């Protein structure tokens, strides 16, 4: 089986490179963030522009939804994160504490905590309600490219240009694991699988890898795309066939069969590097977003 993603909508409006796209957990919305300092909300099913959320002083590198789809958190070159109430557009809290650009962010599953990674080479854990920093982890020795909570929130995974993936105990801040393979390329992205058994990691040598983090073993590698320069998001697609989805520096979306590692589809249309992709939580829908020469978001739908 192969999917049949087809272009349905193109979303224009950001005035600079798009940095991140994410579907709300309730499936209704797509949030996007951009070098243009803005967050935009769009209908997930019709691509219809909903609203703009503004307030950051500098470009935004990441945005993420709370579990109940009510809140967003964003990470900006202004060295802050902001927590937003989506329905009102209000900035509820500005999270101050990183000493350099904040590059990546996520809520835990209970959405009472936020994790962030920064060019300051740290990972910070923040209290959502009070907005105050609970823990700072001296996590890495180069900028932190990605941060993600596991399924119950007891662990954090981080990745860095230092070539390392690390797994942290949320409660204690202790480094429980360092993952690295036979080479030391910068690691540009990581996340836990939906079931929380695995970690998917991107490295800037054109490779994605699926790790059993419990065993410290690399189980699968995905190759064929181009990724040497940018921190490109990758995903597990689980609504239909089980795929791996990623952007690429050849302006395409790549889809692999998770088990076989064969490329099953490539999606053409963007005119610049596809920096970010996201997968709809219940429908076979992919959003993709491209860099400065393109500035658009595209929504693709498949029968499986």
């Amino acid at each position: 089986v192969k999917p049949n993603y087809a272009l349905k909508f193109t979303l224009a409006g950001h005035t600079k490179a798009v940095s991140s796209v994410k579907f709300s957990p309730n499936g209704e919305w797509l949030a996007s963030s951009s070098a243009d300092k803005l967050i935009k909300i769009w209908g997930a099913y019709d691509g219809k522009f909903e609203k703009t959320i503004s307030g950051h002083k500098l470009g935004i590198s990441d945005v993420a939804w709370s579990s109940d789809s009510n809140l967003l958190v964003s990470a900006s070159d202004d060295k802050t994160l902001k927590i937003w109430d989506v329905s009102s557009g209000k900035c509820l809290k500005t999270l101050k504490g990183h000493s350099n650009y904040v590059f990546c962010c996520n809520f835990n599953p209970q959405s009472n905590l936020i994790v962030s990674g920064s060019f300051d080479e740290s990972v910070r854990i923040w209290d959502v309600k009070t907005g105050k920093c609970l823990k700072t982890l001296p996590a890495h020795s180069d900028p932190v490219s990605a941060v993600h909570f596991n399924r119950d929130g007891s662990l954090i995974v981080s990745s860095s240009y230092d070539g390392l993936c690390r797994i942290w105990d949320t409660a204690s801040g202790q480094c429980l694991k360092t993952l690295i393979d036979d080479d030391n390329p910068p690691v540009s992205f990581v996340k836990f699988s939906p079931n929380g058994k695995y970690i998917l990691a991107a490295t800037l040598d054109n490779t994605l890898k699926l790790w059993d983090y419990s065993k410290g073993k690399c189980l699968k590698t995905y190759t064929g795309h181009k990724n040497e320069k940018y921190c490109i998001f990758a995903n597990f697609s689980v609504t239909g066939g089980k795929w791996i989805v990623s952007g690429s520096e050849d302006n395409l979306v790549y889809i692999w069969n998770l088990q076989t590692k064969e490329i099953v589809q490539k999606l053409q249309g963007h005119t610049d590097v596809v920096i970010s992709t996201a997968c709809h939580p219940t429908e076979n829908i992919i959003a993709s977003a491209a860099l400065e020469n393109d500035k658009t978001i595209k929504l693709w739908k498949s029968d499986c």
Binding site: S19, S34, A35, G59, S61, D62, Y230, I275, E292
Partner: peptide, 4 residues
């Protein structure tokens, strides 16, 4: 920054 991601976009650079």
């Amino acid at each position: 920054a991601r976009t650079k």
